[PDB]
Amino acid sequence: AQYEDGKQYTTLEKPVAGAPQVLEFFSFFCPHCYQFEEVLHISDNVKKKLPEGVKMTKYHVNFMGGDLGKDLTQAWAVAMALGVEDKVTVPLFEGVQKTQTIRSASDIRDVFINAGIKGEEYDAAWNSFVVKSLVAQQEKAAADVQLRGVPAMFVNGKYQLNPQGMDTSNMDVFVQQYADTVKYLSEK
Numbered sequence: 001a002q003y004e005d006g007k008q009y010t011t012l013e014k015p016v017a018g019a020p021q022v023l024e025f026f027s028f029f030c031p032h033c034y035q036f037e038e039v040l041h042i043s044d045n046v047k048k049k050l051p052e053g054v055k056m057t058k059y060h061v062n063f064m065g066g067d068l069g070k071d072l073t074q075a076w077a078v079a080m081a082l083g084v085e086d087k088v089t090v091p092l093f094e095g096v097q098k099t100q101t102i103r104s105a106s107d108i109r110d111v112f113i114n115a116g117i118k119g120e121e122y123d124a125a126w127n128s129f130v131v132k133s134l135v136a137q138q139e140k141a142a143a144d145v146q147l148r149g150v151p152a153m154f155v156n157g158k159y160q161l162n163p164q165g166m167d168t169s170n171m172d173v174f175v176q177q178y179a180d181t182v183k184y185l186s187e188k
Protein backbone atom coordinates (compact mmCIF):
# COMPACT_ATOMS: atom_id res chain seq x y z
CA ALA A 1 0.00 0.00 0.00
CA GLN A 2 1.08 3.59 -0.65
CA TYR A 3 0.43 5.29 2.69
CA GLU A 4 -0.34 8.98 2.42
CA ASP A 5 -1.60 11.45 5.01
CA GLY A 6 -5.27 12.12 4.29
CA LYS A 7 -5.77 8.75 2.63
CA GLN A 8 -5.56 5.86 5.11
CA TYR A 9 -4.98 8.16 8.06
CA THR A 10 -4.76 11.74 9.24
CA THR A 11 -2.39 13.44 11.64
CA LEU A 12 -3.52 15.30 14.77
CA GLU A 13 -2.54 18.97 15.01
CA LYS A 14 -1.64 18.65 18.69
CA PRO A 15 -0.58 15.08 19.57
CA VAL A 16 -1.67 13.80 22.98
CA ALA A 17 0.98 12.97 25.57
CA GLY A 18 0.64 9.80 27.64
CA ALA A 19 -1.85 8.43 25.12
CA PRO A 20 -2.51 4.67 24.77
CA GLN A 21 -0.58 3.13 21.89
CA VAL A 22 -3.85 2.03 20.26
CA LEU A 23 -7.05 3.76 21.35
CA GLU A 24 -10.51 3.01 19.91
CA PHE A 25 -13.70 4.98 20.52
CA PHE A 26 -17.19 3.56 19.92
CA SER A 27 -20.85 3.88 20.88
CA PHE A 28 -23.44 1.14 21.30
CA PHE A 29 -25.72 3.43 19.26
CA CYS A 30 -23.22 3.66 16.40
CA PRO A 31 -24.19 1.67 13.26
CA HIS A 32 -20.66 1.31 11.88
CA CYS A 33 -19.49 0.29 15.35
CA TYR A 34 -22.00 -2.57 15.31
CA GLN A 35 -20.43 -3.82 12.09
CA PHE A 36 -16.89 -3.28 13.47
CA GLU A 37 -17.86 -5.63 16.28
CA GLU A 38 -20.19 -8.27 14.81
CA VAL A 39 -19.04 -8.95 11.23
CA LEU A 40 -15.66 -7.23 10.79
CA HIS A 41 -14.15 -7.88 14.24
CA ILE A 42 -11.80 -4.90 13.76
CA SER A 43 -10.30 -5.02 17.27
CA ASP A 44 -9.50 -8.74 17.08
CA ASN A 45 -7.83 -8.41 13.73
CA VAL A 46 -5.87 -5.32 14.71
CA LYS A 47 -4.65 -7.20 17.79
CA LYS A 48 -3.62 -10.15 15.64
CA LYS A 49 -1.54 -8.00 13.28
CA LEU A 50 0.23 -6.11 16.06
CA PRO A 51 3.07 -7.47 18.23
CA GLU A 52 2.15 -9.14 21.51
CA GLY A 53 2.43 -6.49 24.20
CA VAL A 54 0.89 -3.61 22.29
CA LYS A 55 -1.71 -2.00 24.54
CA MET A 56 -5.15 -1.71 22.97
CA THR A 57 -7.73 0.47 24.70
CA LYS A 58 -11.43 0.90 23.88
CA TYR A 59 -13.65 3.68 25.27
CA HIS A 60 -17.38 4.48 24.92
CA VAL A 61 -18.61 7.95 24.00
CA ASN A 62 -21.50 10.13 25.18
CA PHE A 63 -22.62 12.01 22.10
CA MET A 64 -24.96 9.30 20.80
CA GLY A 65 -28.22 8.07 22.33
CA GLY A 66 -29.35 10.80 24.73
CA ASP A 67 -29.73 10.03 28.44
CA LEU A 68 -29.20 6.34 27.74
CA GLY A 69 -25.91 7.19 26.00
CA LYS A 70 -24.38 8.57 29.20
CA ASP A 71 -25.59 5.48 31.05
CA LEU A 72 -23.93 3.22 28.48
CA THR A 73 -20.66 5.08 28.99
CA GLN A 74 -20.99 4.37 32.73
CA ALA A 75 -21.94 0.77 31.92
CA TRP A 76 -18.82 0.44 29.76
CA ALA A 77 -16.78 1.72 32.72
CA VAL A 78 -18.35 -1.04 34.83
CA ALA A 79 -17.39 -3.56 32.14
CA MET A 80 -13.80 -2.29 32.13
CA ALA A 81 -13.58 -2.32 35.93
CA LEU A 82 -14.91 -5.89 36.18
CA GLY A 83 -13.10 -7.04 33.05
CA VAL A 84 -16.25 -8.36 31.40
CA GLU A 85 -16.16 -6.33 28.16
CA ASP A 86 -16.24 -9.51 26.06
CA LYS A 87 -19.29 -10.75 27.99
CA VAL A 88 -21.51 -7.72 27.41
CA THR A 89 -20.48 -6.14 24.12
CA VAL A 90 -22.76 -8.24 21.90
CA PRO A 91 -25.89 -8.15 24.07
CA LEU A 92 -25.48 -4.39 24.59
CA PHE A 93 -25.07 -3.81 20.84
CA GLU A 94 -28.03 -6.03 19.97
CA GLY A 95 -30.14 -4.73 22.86
CA VAL A 96 -29.73 -1.19 21.52
CA GLN A 97 -29.69 -1.60 17.73
CA LYS A 98 -31.23 -5.00 16.92
CA THR A 99 -34.06 -5.75 19.37
CA GLN A 100 -34.26 -2.21 20.81
CA THR A 101 -35.00 -3.70 24.23
CA ILE A 102 -32.48 -1.46 25.98
CA ARG A 103 -34.40 1.71 26.85
CA SER A 104 -33.15 2.58 30.37
CA ALA A 105 -30.37 1.91 32.87
CA SER A 106 -32.44 -0.98 34.29
CA ASP A 107 -32.32 -2.77 30.93
CA ILE A 108 -28.54 -2.36 30.88
CA ARG A 109 -28.43 -3.95 34.31
CA ASP A 110 -30.52 -6.90 33.06
CA VAL A 111 -27.95 -7.47 30.32
CA PHE A 112 -25.05 -7.69 32.77
CA ILE A 113 -27.07 -10.04 35.03
CA ASN A 114 -27.93 -12.28 32.09
CA ALA A 115 -24.28 -12.32 31.06
CA GLY A 116 -23.54 -13.84 34.47
CA ILE A 117 -22.48 -10.75 36.41
CA LYS A 118 -23.90 -10.92 39.93
CA GLY A 119 -26.40 -8.14 40.58
CA GLU A 120 -24.77 -7.00 43.81
CA GLU A 121 -21.39 -6.85 42.08
CA TYR A 122 -22.83 -4.79 39.25
CA ASP A 123 -24.54 -2.34 41.61
CA ALA A 124 -21.38 -1.85 43.66
CA ALA A 125 -19.37 -1.20 40.52
CA TRP A 126 -22.05 1.07 39.04
CA ASN A 127 -21.86 3.30 42.10
CA SER A 128 -18.10 3.08 42.64
CA PHE A 129 -15.61 5.93 42.40
CA VAL A 130 -13.32 3.65 40.41
CA VAL A 131 -16.09 3.58 37.80
CA LYS A 132 -16.65 7.35 38.16
CA SER A 133 -12.95 7.80 37.39
CA LEU A 134 -13.20 5.55 34.32
CA VAL A 135 -16.10 7.66 33.04
CA ALA A 136 -14.01 10.78 33.49
CA GLN A 137 -11.11 9.03 31.74
CA GLN A 138 -13.24 8.11 28.71
CA GLU A 139 -14.59 11.66 28.45
CA LYS A 140 -11.17 13.29 28.84
CA ALA A 141 -9.64 10.96 26.23
CA ALA A 142 -12.27 11.97 23.67
CA ALA A 143 -11.83 15.65 24.44
CA ASP A 144 -8.05 15.34 24.12
CA VAL A 145 -8.33 14.21 20.50
CA GLN A 146 -11.21 16.54 19.63
CA LEU A 147 -13.40 13.50 18.92
CA ARG A 148 -16.29 14.28 16.56
CA GLY A 149 -17.52 10.84 15.55
CA VAL A 150 -17.25 7.09 15.97
CA PRO A 151 -15.88 4.54 15.23
CA ALA A 152 -12.47 6.12 15.63
CA MET A 153 -9.00 4.82 16.31
CA PHE A 154 -5.91 6.69 17.37
CA VAL A 155 -2.33 5.51 17.27
CA ASN A 156 0.22 6.85 19.76
CA GLY A 157 -2.02 9.88 20.29
CA LYS A 158 -0.87 11.24 16.95
CA TYR A 159 -2.51 9.43 14.03
CA GLN A 160 -6.19 8.90 13.37
CA LEU A 161 -7.44 6.04 11.20
CA ASN A 162 -9.41 7.07 8.10
CA PRO A 163 -11.65 4.12 7.12
CA GLN A 164 -13.60 6.28 4.64
CA GLY A 165 -10.68 6.07 2.25
CA MET A 166 -10.40 2.29 2.35
CA ASP A 167 -11.79 -0.31 -0.04
CA THR A 168 -15.34 -1.52 0.69
CA SER A 169 -15.87 -4.15 -2.01
CA ASN A 170 -14.78 -6.98 0.30
CA MET A 171 -15.18 -7.15 4.09
CA ASP A 172 -11.89 -8.94 4.70
CA VAL A 173 -9.97 -6.64 2.38
CA PHE A 174 -11.37 -3.70 4.31
CA VAL A 175 -10.24 -5.29 7.57
CA GLN A 176 -6.83 -6.10 6.08
CA GLN A 177 -6.32 -2.50 4.90
CA TYR A 178 -7.48 -1.16 8.26
CA ALA A 179 -5.27 -3.46 10.32
CA ASP A 180 -2.27 -2.97 8.05
CA THR A 181 -2.65 0.81 8.44
CA VAL A 182 -2.64 0.46 12.23
CA LYS A 183 0.55 -1.64 11.97
CA TYR A 184 2.18 0.92 9.66
CA LEU A 185 1.31 3.77 12.03
CA SER A 186 2.46 1.88 15.12
CA GLU A 187 5.91 1.56 13.50
CA LYS A 188 5.88 5.25 12.58
Ligand SMILES: O=C(O)c1ccccc1NS(=O)(=O)c1ccc(I)cc1
Nearest residue numbers: 032035036163164168169170171174
Ligand atom coordinates in the same frame (compact mmCIF):
# COMPACT_ATOMS: atom_id res chain seq x y z
O1 LIG B 1 -20.80 1.90 5.27
C1 LIG B 1 -20.00 2.67 4.67
O2 LIG B 1 -20.28 3.42 3.73
C2 LIG B 1 -18.59 2.69 5.18
C3 LIG B 1 -17.63 3.30 4.36
C4 LIG B 1 -16.29 3.38 4.75
C5 LIG B 1 -15.93 2.86 5.96
C6 LIG B 1 -16.88 2.27 6.79
C7 LIG B 1 -18.21 2.17 6.43
N1 LIG B 1 -19.14 1.52 7.37
S1 LIG B 1 -19.07 -0.01 7.99
O3 LIG B 1 -18.08 -0.12 8.99
O4 LIG B 1 -20.39 -0.42 8.34
C8 LIG B 1 -18.58 -1.10 6.71
C9 LIG B 1 -17.22 -1.30 6.40
C10 LIG B 1 -16.79 -2.15 5.37
C11 LIG B 1 -17.74 -2.80 4.62
I1 LIG B 1 -17.17 -4.03 3.12
C12 LIG B 1 -19.09 -2.64 4.86
C13 LIG B 1 -19.47 -1.79 5.90
